[PDB]
Design an enzyme around this catalytic site. Structure first.
Site, mmCIF file in Angstrom:
data_model
loop_
_atom_site.group_PDB
_atom_site.id
_atom_site.type_symbol
_atom_site.label_atom_id
_atom_site.label_comp_id
_atom_site.label_asym_id
_atom_site.label_seq_id
_atom_site.Cartn_x
_atom_site.Cartn_y
_atom_site.Cartn_z
ATOM 1 N N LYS A 62 0.819 -1.187 0.000
ATOM 2 C CA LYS A 62 0.000 0.000 0.000
ATOM 3 C C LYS A 62 0.866 1.255 0.000
ATOM 4 O O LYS A 62 0.523 2.261 -0.634
ATOM 5 C CB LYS A 62 -0.951 -0.046 1.202
ATOM 6 C CG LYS A 62 -1.967 -1.201 1.116
ATOM 7 C CD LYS A 62 -2.983 -1.140 2.261
ATOM 8 C CE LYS A 62 -4.191 -2.060 2.029
ATOM 9 N NZ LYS A 62 -3.904 -3.498 2.267
ATOM 10 N N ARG A 170 4.400 17.183 27.964
ATOM 11 C CA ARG A 170 5.245 16.807 26.838
ATOM 12 C C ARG A 170 5.616 18.041 26.002
ATOM 13 O O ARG A 170 6.276 17.925 24.974
ATOM 14 C CB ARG A 170 4.565 15.744 25.962
ATOM 15 C CG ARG A 170 4.275 14.415 26.684
ATOM 16 C CD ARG A 170 4.233 13.225 25.713
ATOM 17 N NE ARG A 170 3.259 13.391 24.632
ATOM 18 C CZ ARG A 170 1.940 13.272 24.772
ATOM 19 N NH1 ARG A 170 1.409 12.978 25.953
ATOM 20 N NH2 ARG A 170 1.147 13.458 23.724
ATOM 21 N N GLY A 176 -5.601 18.687 24.300
ATOM 22 C CA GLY A 176 -6.962 18.194 24.132
ATOM 23 C C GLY A 176 -7.764 18.348 25.413
ATOM 24 O O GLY A 176 -8.978 18.576 25.399
#
Ligand SMILES: [Mg+2]
Ligand code: NA
Ligand code: NA
Ligand code: NA
Length: 325
Positions: A62, A170, A176
């Site tokens: 792919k 991080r 989020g």
DNA sequence: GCCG
DNA sequence: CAGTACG
DNA sequence: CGGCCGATACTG
């Protein structure tokens, strides 16, 4: 990322298989993607792809069709239900099983869900905050949220240690949600504080909705909810808080800092060494059954710091910023 | 899907 | 328990 | 063949 053209197409499938419930196939694609985006250079040959850990013959195929056709024939045969399953699965509290059930019941839009679906208490909150739960906030706002939680906590106990983890620790530009780890150096003053912390945050009107919060249990470990800072132009943000005993501080911090894929890889490594790693502790010589599942206790290893966990696993330490997978 |  | 969720 | 993180933590 030097293979965005490839990772962006494989992402479509990974997500498709995920919402359809083919979890292991989805993982394969996800780990192949985490590998390509982590590659030190763009891929060019079929063989060069197979040499990359996480990419096999089929995936490599792919990958060549993409680099060799600008496109991928498989993306044109994805079920027409996928977009809707993803729409539904993006409601907090609803996963592949619920999304597939709603689809089978004839639902096709959030309007359908709103008016005809039976929703769990969590899902109703998820729907109400559908758009906000898909947005990220600037890290500066995450700081404000962590500070709100820290101040309320230290208000009744100045010794409580509060640290923002996840993508925030991080070093990401946006987050989020906000992950706040709370513990106490004396290894005892952390017990039964959720009751006081939450009601305090509720008094000032900071918390707007609760998703997961077992407050009847004095052994509550986490709070997953929704908050909103005061003033105009503010959105509802996801807030995840965990309270842990000091002896488990390092393992909990390592866990809550992630990334999720980093945690999974590290835990898989520990297992290959006859150990077990979780947010609670790192243990050696644990007892496992014929399927690899832990069924007996090993010996909990001393891990006062994150470095100790890396050291005990024979791994070079990695700053939080380098655990972004 | 990947890998042993 | 199955489902969903956290990193 | 069969694991792919956690003897992970809540919900109902
Ligand atoms: Mg987070
Ligand atoms: Na490979
Ligand atoms: Na969801
Ligand atoms: Na509750």
């Amino acid at each position: 990322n030097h293979n965005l053209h490839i990772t962006e197409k494989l992402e479509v499938l990974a997500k498709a298989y995920s919402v359809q419930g083919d979890k292991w196939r989805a993982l394969g694609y996800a780990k192949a993607i985490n590998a390509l985006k982590s590659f030190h250079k763009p891929v060019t040959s079929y063989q060069e792809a197979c040499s990359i850990p996480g990419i096999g013959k089929r995936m490599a195929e792919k990958i060549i069709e993409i680099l060799e056709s600008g496109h991928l024939r498989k993306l044109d045969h994805i079920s027409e239900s996928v977009p809707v399953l993803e729409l539904f699965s993006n409601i907090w509290g609803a996963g592949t099983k619920t999304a597939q059930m709603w689809y089978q019941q004839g639902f096709r839009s959030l309007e359908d869900i709103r008016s005809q679906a039976s929703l769990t208490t969590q899902q109703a909150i998820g729907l109400k905050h559908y758009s906000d739960f898909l947005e990220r906030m600037p890290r500066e706002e995450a700081t404000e949220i962590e500070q709100t939680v820290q101040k309320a906590a230290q208000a009744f106990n100045s010794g409580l240690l509060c640290v923002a983890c996840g993508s925030y620790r991080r070093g990401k530009a946006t987050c989020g949600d906000v992950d706040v780890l709370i513990t106490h150096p004396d290894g005892r003053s952390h017990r039964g504080i959720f009751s006081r912390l939450l009601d305090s945050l509720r008094q000032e009107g900071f918390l707007t909705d609760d998703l997961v919060s077992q407050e009847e249990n004095g052994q509550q470990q986490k709070y997953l909810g929704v908050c909103r800072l005061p003033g105009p132009g503010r959105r509802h943000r996801r807030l995840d808080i965990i309270v842990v005993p000091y002896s488990e501080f390092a393992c909990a911090l390592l866990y809550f800092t992630g990334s999720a894929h980093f945690n999974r890889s590290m835990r898989a490594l520990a297992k290959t060494k006859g150990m077990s790693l979780s947010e609670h502790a790192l243990s050696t010589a644990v007892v496992r059954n014929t399927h690899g599942c832990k069924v007996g206790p090993g010996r909990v290893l001393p891990t006062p710091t994150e470095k100790d966990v890396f050291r005990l696993l024979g791994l070079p330490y990695r700053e939080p910023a380098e655990r972004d997978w």
